[PDB]
Every structure is written in structure tokens, then in C-alpha cells.
């Protein structure tokens, strides 16, 4: 039972209980007024101030209002600014502040709250774990790694710290090293470890080192509801979408797009080659640690449904052609990009992040031998001026062992069963 009342708040516990009763009975408007009255009457009261914040929080949920929730976030801070705040209340108030900041996407704000929490409570390992998450959410992997190293130095069997440390190691390409942390962390069963991200990356790391137990973890991640299937391991999904590794144009319904790509393929090719020849810096190396070896770069025209204007200067006719197809130019969970791969390249088996897109590949310069792509259990080759269509949320793998370069054009489309409102509302990836 948390101790939320300081000495003075115990003397007004009756008033505080009455207001909290209104709030828990669901009479949130009355509760807000009751706690506002307690705050004006007892301006230093931490329990009254916390009640005001919790009422605003509840109101925000009732109205699904981010504005009301921002109000609550400020009142939770006010609580911590008052005199003589009981430790349990201080911790609850600032924790909920950080949690609602994260819910709103204020990740830098959440991080600052979490840093303050760890200063105020230096022996709370769970708060350190939460701080590490804060760092991860702003992209500060170096500081996250230090936090989890500290956690493990004091509580070496903490499963949450183990899985997050392994995640960080894996992301740094420390594949072998990451495996024991990911595995031990998932096996710990500790809260926060039963997370698709850790199954996904444990299996990927094992595949990379040749350890055959990878699909054991894929099956268990499936059994625990993280993956639609053992083959399809995307983690940002709309459930229910038709799932198959390979699609025909008519199955997708995007027949006009496929026809435009194939009928105009030489123009698309020639713009890509001109960029290779005189603007090669527009092609950026693949930067998601997906390769075993080899050279692979991409020249991106659209990402997250936004045209790259400078890029489109390099492929102006191709970009004009594509503007007629919002199913791709507005695909905020895919890209439109040229992709060049050179001999000696092997892309590790891997999965895209979302089942909400399908990926078209138009062949532009395809050596007669040496290039192929596997998706799930079917392996195919490209052809110049022909489109292949696969669902990259299924595990897929690519090889380039020709004697010259291989150029394709990649056009992501919205999964065809997604409705217009889904296409408008789904968070971009």
C-alpha cells in the first residue's frame, strides 16, 4: 500500500478521499472541480495536486484529447515541485508524467523526467531500466548501453536489462555477443522481456552465425503472438491482411502501375544510369546492417510518402510518371528507389518492418546469370522490363554473383486490402 499522504495531507484525508471517490466513481467533472477546490484551499498539498493531475489524465482518456493530457503532464510536475512530497507519491507522479510524455511522443521530455527520477531514486533498478528505454527512444544507443551495463553490474540476472543490452549489442553488429543476452533475457520471463523485438533479433543473430536453433525462437515468438507466422515476422501490422510471399499484378489490383512501369522501363533505366554516371553520390550505401558482404546502394525518390525534390531532379521523367499512382507515392510505409547491387553481395535473410506494404521490383540492368531473390520458400530472378512483386514482411534473401552490376527499381505499394482511412491514418514507417 503506497504511502501518499504527508503529515498535513493526513489532516485533510476526508476531503481528499471524497474527491478521489468522485474520480473513481467516474464523476470526473465533479472530481476535477473538487480537487481544484482542494488545490486552491491547500496550495501546498501534494495529494490534492496529484488528484488534479489524475483527474486531467482521466479526462484526457474520456475525451481522447492530447491537449487535456498535456495539461495533466504539467500538473504531475507541479506535484513534484511542492514541499514535503512522500517518496511513493513523488515516484508515481513523475513516472506517470514520463509515461504520458512517451504516449504523446515527447521523447526528449520523457527522457528528462526519467533522468530526474534516477537522480531522486538512485537504488531503483527499474527506474534505471526505464531510463535506458528513454535513451533508446531518442536514438542514443551509447547512453542506453551504459545504463544497462550499470544495471547488470548491480543486478546481473535482471532479464529486462539483459534483453535490452542484447538488443543494443545486436544493433552494433556484435552478433555472437548479443545472443546470450537476448536468449537469457527472454528465458528470464521478467516483465518487459516477452517482446517481439527480442525474438526477432535473437533469431536473426543466430541465423547470421549459423546456429540452427533460430527457428525454434521464431516458433516460440509465433506461439506467443508476436509474429503472424514463422515466415512473416514484421512487427508493425494491420491484422487480417492477406499474407503470401509472392503476388501477381492482378492479385494486387495495381495493373495500371505495373503496366506503366513495364511499358516505360527504358526511361526509368536510363535516368538511373545517368545518375550512376554523373551524380553517383545520390546513391547511398545500404545502412541497416543487412549485408553479409558486398556493395549495395540505393537512390531514393520517395520515402514515407514524401517526394525527395533534389532526388527527383535526377530522375524527373520517372518522378512525373509515378505522380499518377498515389498507391505508391502516398505509401507512407514504403519507398520508391533505385537499387544497385554488385557482384559478391549476399544479403542476410531478413524481414521488413510491416505487413502493410507490397514491394514491386522492376528489372532495369539484370546480368544473365548470378542474381536471384528468395522470398519464403520460392526463389525467383529478375528480368529487364518486368515487374516482380513480393511481400517483404516475409523472410527474403538476395544474392549477386554476376560479373557486372544489377540495377532494379523498387516501388512500394499499400497492401491492397487496406482501406482509404487506414492509408490516411497509419503511422508512417
Amino acid at each position: 500500500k503506497p504511502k501518499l499522504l504527508n503529515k498535513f495531507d493526513k489532516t485533510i484525508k476526508a476531503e481528499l478521499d471524497a474527491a478521489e471517490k468522485l474520480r473513481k466513481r467516474g464523476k470526473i467533472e465533479e472530481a476535477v472541480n473538487a480537487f481544484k477546490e482542494l488545490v486552491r484551499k491547500y496550495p501546498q498539498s501534494p495529494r490534492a495536486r496529484y488528484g488534479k493531475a489524475q483527474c486531467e489524465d482521466d479526462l484526457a482518456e474520456k475525451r481522447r484529447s492530447n491537449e487535456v493530457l498535456r495539461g495533466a503532464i504539467e500538473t504531475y510536475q507541479e506535484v513534484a515541485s511542492l514541499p514535503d512530497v512522500p517518496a511513493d507519491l513523488l515516484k508515481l507522479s513523475l513516472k506517470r508524467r514520463s509515461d504520458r510524455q512517451q504516449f504523446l511522443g515527447h521523447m526528449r521530455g520523457s527522457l528528462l523526467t526519467l533522468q530526474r527520477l534516477v537522480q531522486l531514486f538512485p537504488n531503483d533498478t527499474s527506474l534505471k531500466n526505464d531510463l535506458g528505454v528513454g535513451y533508446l527512444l531518442i536514438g542514443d544507443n551509447d547512453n542506453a548501453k551504459k545504463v544497462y551495463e550499470e544495471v547488470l553490474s548491480v543486478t546481473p540476472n535482471d532479464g529486462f536489462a539483459k534483453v535490452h543490452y542484447g538488443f543494443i549489442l545486436k544493433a552494433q553488429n556484435k552478433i555472437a555477443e548479443s545472443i546470450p543476452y537476448l536468449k537469457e533475457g527472454i528465458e528470464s520471463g521478467d516483465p518487459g522481456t516477452d517482446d517481439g523485438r527480442f525474438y526477432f533479433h535473437l533469431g536473426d543473430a543466430m541465423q547470421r552465425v549459423g546456429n540452427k536453433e533460430a527457428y525454434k525462437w521464431y516458433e516460440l515468438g509465433h506461439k506467443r503472438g508476436h509474429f503472424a507466422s514463422v515466415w512473416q515476422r514484421s512487427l508493425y501490422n494491420v491484422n487480417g491482411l492477406k499474407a503470401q510471399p509472392w503476388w501477381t499484378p492482378k492479385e494486387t489490383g495495381y495493373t495500371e502501375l505495373v503496366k506503366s512501369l513495364e511499358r516505360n522501363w527504358k526511361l526509368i533505366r536510363d535516368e538511373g544510369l545517368a545518375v550512376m554516371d554523373k551524380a553517383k553520390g545520390l546513391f547511398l550505401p545500404e545502412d541497416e546492417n543487412l549485408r553479409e558482404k558486398g556493395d549495395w546502394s540505393q537512390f531514393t525518390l520517395w520515402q514515407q510518402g514524401r517526394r525527395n525534390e533534389n532526388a527527383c531532379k535526377g530522375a524527373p521523367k520517372t518522378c512525373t510518371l509515378l505522380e499518377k499512382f498515389p498507391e505508391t507515392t502516398g505509401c507512407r510505409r514504403g519507398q520508391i528507389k533505385y537499387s544497385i547491387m554488385h557482384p559478391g553481395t549476399h544479403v542476410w535473410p531478413a524481414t521488413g518492418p510491416t505487413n502493410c506494404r507490397l514491394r514491386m521490383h522492376l528489372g532495369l540492368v539484370i546480368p544473365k546469370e548470378g542474381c536471384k531473390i528468395r522470398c519464403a520458400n520460392e526463389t525467383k530472378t529478375w528480368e529487364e522490363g518486368k515487374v516482380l512483386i513480393f511481400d517483404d514482411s516475409f523472410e527474403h534473401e538476395v544474392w549477386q554473383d554476376a560479373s557486372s552490376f544489377r540495377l532494379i527499381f523498387i516501388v512500394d505499394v499499400w497492401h491492397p486490402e487496406l482501406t482509404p482511412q487506414q492509408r490516411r491514418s497509419l503511422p508512417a514507417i
Binding site: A171, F200, L290
Partner: peptide, 20 residues
Amino acid sequence: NQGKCKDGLGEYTCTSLEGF
């Protein structure tokens, strides 16, 4: 996460949250 999940799933989170 200051990096995006384009082809893979390598970031801790792939989306930016917007509340309700």
C-alpha cells in the same frame, strides 16, 4: 530513434507516436 526502418527492423521503434 533518429533512424528509420526502411528495409529492416533494426531500430528500437519504427514509428513516432502522436497520442490519441
